[PDB]
Structures are given as structure tokens and as C-alpha cells.
Amino acid sequence: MFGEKAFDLLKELERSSQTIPAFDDDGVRQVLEEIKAIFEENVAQASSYNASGDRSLWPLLNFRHAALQRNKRCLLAYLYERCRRIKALRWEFGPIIPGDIKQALCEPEVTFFNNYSKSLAAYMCSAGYNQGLPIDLTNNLRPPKSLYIEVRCMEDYGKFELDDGEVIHLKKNSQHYLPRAQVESLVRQGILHHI
């Protein structure tokens, strides 16, 4: 408001807990149309004879400084909480099943997202094995059993199961030719509290 809105900025995701319909790129547009409205004054009097080198201008310096503080750190929040919750579900699956939308990528976030994906790439490479065994770590926790059967679940959408089946219809009654490598992604996104 004069530096308050970030609690309003995540509110696009207010309902999006684990029953999420979809997500969007809210709250940047007018808000960084600000920053080019203000730099004019922030560097207006740089070593100027506008006041002939006098002490009085010290509030202006700190004005710029705190403005930068608030802007940058709300940016860190709008970055880091997005990455962190998405990192939770991205530990609940690789890039097998990515986000519900991939339309709310705040455009530069391609680098951000994919770098963290390559965080897990490094993780896989060094960990698991020295050459790198991608170590099955947070999903598909069945003890050694059959490889190919389907079962019942509870209505997920997004429909991104590209893994090894023709079309499995990943919802309740995703009940078709499912191999093990097909069904390798789900433990908790809202799917199989019930076989």
C-alpha cells in the first residue's frame, strides 16, 4: 500500500492448498511500473548543485534505500514461496507430472524452475550412485510386487501422464494398460489415499 501488499500477492493461491483448480501470474504489472516512476527522484540530485552540497538531503538517500529493501524482499518472497511449495510437490514427483497449468510461469521463471529441476539433476548424479542412479526417493513406494496392473483413485486432472501408456486417463478410473513405469509418479497429490 506503501509497502504492504505481498500478503495480498500470494492470495491468488489462497484456496490452492491441495485442491488447487489452477494458478496465475498475479501482482507484478502496475507494481513494477512503479519502479521506473521513482528512479528519476532517487538519482535526481546525484552530486548536483541543486542544493550546493548541503546536509538536508539525507532523508532522500534512505528513502531510496528502504524502497529498494521493501521491493527486493517482497520479490524474494514471491519467488521463494512459489519455488518452495512447488518444490514440495516437485519432491512428490519429478518433471514427470509438472504443474497443473504451466501458464502461471512469471516469464523469467523458466530459468528458475528448470535450475531447481537441475538441482535435482545434480542430486541424482552424485547421490544414488557416483555415476548417478536416480534414487527413487519420494513416490511409488510399493514393496516389490507386480509390474502391470491398474487400480482406483480419486479424480485428479492435468492429464500429463506421458509415461509408457497409450492413454491411461489419470483420474478415478485411470483403469487401463498401466505399467509400473507408467504409474511411477503418484503417492500424494490428491490421488491414492485409496487404492
Partner: protein, 542 residues
Amino acid sequence: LRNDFYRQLVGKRILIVVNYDIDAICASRILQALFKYDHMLYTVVPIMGVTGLKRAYGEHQGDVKYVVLVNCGGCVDIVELLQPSDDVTFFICDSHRPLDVCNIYSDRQVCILGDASLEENIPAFETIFYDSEGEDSGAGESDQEDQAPHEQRILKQRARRQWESERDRIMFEYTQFSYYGRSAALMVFELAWKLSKDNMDLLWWAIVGITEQLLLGKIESGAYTLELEQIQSHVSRLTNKTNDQNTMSASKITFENDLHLVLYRHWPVTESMRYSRYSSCQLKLWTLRGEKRLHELLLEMGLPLVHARQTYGAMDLVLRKEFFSMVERLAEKYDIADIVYGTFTLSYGYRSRYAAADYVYALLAIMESVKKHKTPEDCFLEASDALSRQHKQLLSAGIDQAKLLHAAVFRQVQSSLEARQVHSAGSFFYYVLQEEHAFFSYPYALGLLARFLLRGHVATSRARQASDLPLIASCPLNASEGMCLLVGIVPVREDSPRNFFGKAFEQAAQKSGVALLQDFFEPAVVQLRQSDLTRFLDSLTV
């Protein structure tokens, strides 16, 4: 017998459970637990109808090997129904026994659970596909021109003579009457009992399985006064504690001789003496007089009236302990004889001591034919998620729902009877109905409707001339734009002489035939158009 086949069962499977039942869930949750024991993942299935089954196999159209269906089988020559069946392992275990033998033979892809004191169909196949007329088996199946290793064509005459003279017994099969047979998963209990499984809750589940259709009026027990030996012999003989049973959780389950009047335990009395058939009809309470004869029995018991409108659980002590200690002996002499039967009971803990059948009358009431369009399968998934010891917030809601239905039932019976809606209409009795209820949409509740009117009218307004005649009923579905449901039901008190109507309605279908369906594996049921029954009823008289 699968002490030998069960060691085949490790690889992948599909566990199907055909259309909704209490035999179903009881016989299947046990197998769920079994198959999560030896580390296999598997599949449980809902069936809403045989089309759901064919699309299910279509939806499971792979080469899955150990495919299973339970409590079905009489639909097709299932080899003919099932094309991709080439050498796949099928399993039946159904108690609807009167099935054709085309399904039994071809010993690759079926499992003949043929075991009974009835060697009644031994040559039953030796002429149907083995012989033929108007078609080298060296029989009528092959050529019939004096080429098969009084006239040249009396071959066919003797062939059809044998054929039809034993269609005297083929028409006896599937064309005179239907039933069910034996249990749903008591065989499965004794199967698993070799594997050292002392799951008391499994005993309770199979008790639920039997006491559904232990209803010797609905479906026969037979084994009953023999299972008072058998089931106790399963459980009673093997005692894990002779001295340590004063325990909190799941104390080793018991048996006692109690009654089948509805919900004696959880409700007050004078409304719960009112909703059963055997206590009501034999005391005739929908007329005013029945309250008086009831009252004069309450005298002889001398319970208080105020108490008889308090919950049995809510009464003071000594009456509520001495209740059945009295009723069993001074009810035999006052028109009612046969509510006392053989059943079980146990508590989990301290809350209260559930009644061994009082789940099924909540289960039957969990069939919520709601307009959300999903709820039957969700009702299944709730039901099998109910029978445990864990989920219990919902069983009370089930009881509440059940009782309010059971006291809505009568509300229509007085309405229908004393207006004399009992249309005779010839050789049988006949009923008709007009608009929809969420109560009695589906047919289980509909048979429950019929089986109060029936006893009431047919017992009380006639001589003994017509007390043995059968039943039908309408039931509309404003759900599906007008289909005018019907169900067939039997005459009075003939336990073994069960339904003619395994097909008998199909007489009029043979004569004229109008948009008839048999979508359920249940035979005792049909489904129609909205009002295209009247001429079909004129046909369906004889």
C-alpha cells in the same frame, strides 16, 4: 478347493465383485486383506450392471491372467460373451447355482465348483451341441443323411424325441424357477482357516454375510441349526485364553439365542414393535384394535407405558435385563411364535454392544439413489470402509437413516390399503404406483414394500382359498424420464418353493415383446418403458 490352486495365485490379478450385495462386500474385503498379505497389488470392482461388466473387461482389456468374478456366472455361455478369453484363468464361486453347463465345460477357462447331492444333469450336454437337426461328430451334430459313424430320416426323429423328452428337464433348468444356493464366503473362511488366520473380525464379517440371507423368509439358511454346531466348532473349540478374557479390546466373540425384531437395542419399543412384519401383521396394528391387543400383552408383561416410549438402552436396569428373559415364553401363546433366532454380538469397548445384524439394515439404507449421479459406487466404497472396527461415526448415521426409512414404510401402507388399492386382476395379485420417492427408488426397498402389504392384505381379507398367490408391483423412476419398474415376488410361506419368475415374466415377452431389459445379474427384476405395460400386462396375465 484351492489348497492347490491358491499356490498359483501370486502373480497379477483382478478381483471383481458383481452387483451390489452384502454377500459381496463381506466375501471380498477378506480377500483384499488376504492379497495384501503375500505382497500382491490387486483390484476391487463396482458393478452397476452387466454392461458395466463388459465395459470393465473392455477397460481391463489386457491379458491379465488370474481374473476373478464372484457371485455371478449365469449371463451367457461366457466363452461366447468373452472373445479374448483364450487360456485365461477364470474363477466362479457363485451361489446362484442354476446355471447352464455350456459355462461349465471347456475345461481351460472356468473352474467347476460342482459339489452337491444332486446328480441331475449328467447327460445334459450329450444332445444339445453333440446332436443337432437341420444343420464329423458322427451324431446329429454331423450329417444326418445316414452318415454318422424305419426310414432314412427317423435319425432326426429319435434325436428330437430324446432332446424334447429331456427338455422336460432342460425346461426344468432356467425355465421353471431360480434361487440361490450356499454361502458367499463361509467356504472362503474354511479355505483361509488352513493358513492360521484367527481374525475374529473375519468371523463377524462372514456372520454379516450369512445373516443377510439367513433370513429364512427372504432366503434360506438350511445349515442354520447345523451351523449352531459348525461355526462354534470353528471358533469355540480353539480357545486362546481359558482364564484371560476380561480385556478391553475385541473380547473373543460370542453367540446367543435372540430375536429378529427390528432394532430392539438402539431405539424405544412401541415404535419398534410396529415396523417389522412378523410382529405387526400377526397383531394387526395398522387397524386401531392392534394397539389394544398389543397393550393387553404389555399388561401381561406389565412393563410401564412410559418406559415403552424410552430407548431400551435408556431404561432403568432390571426391566432391560429381564426383557427377553420374559418375552420368549409368554409370547408363544399370543399369535406370534418365530422371531427368536440364532445370532451373535460383541463390543469393541465401552461405548455400547452392537448387534450382529444391525449393520445390514444400515447397509441396505446406505443405498442412496441420490441425484448427484455418482453415489452408488461411493456407497459401495463407504460400505466396505464401514464394516471395520475403525470407521464408526457413519454407522450411527446409517442406523438413523434406516429407522426413518422403516417408519416411512408403514406411512404408505395404511395409505394404500384402506383405499383398497389391492387390485386382484385375475390369476395373481397386482399393484400399481404413481410417482417417485428417494426412499423406494431402487428395488431392495421395493421388495420390502411388497412384503408388508402382502402379508397384511392376503392374510386379512379372504378365506383360505387365495392365501397362496404371487405378487408384482409397479415402481416409477422420475429419475430416468419414465420406465415403470417392476419386480416379481413369491406367495406365502413356501421356503423351498421359490420364484417362478426367474423368467416367467418373459411369457408376455415371447408373445409380443416390448423394450424389455434384464440388465441385472439378478433375475427377479425387470425394467420397462414409462407406460407400455398395460397391453403387456394383458399379455402377462397367463
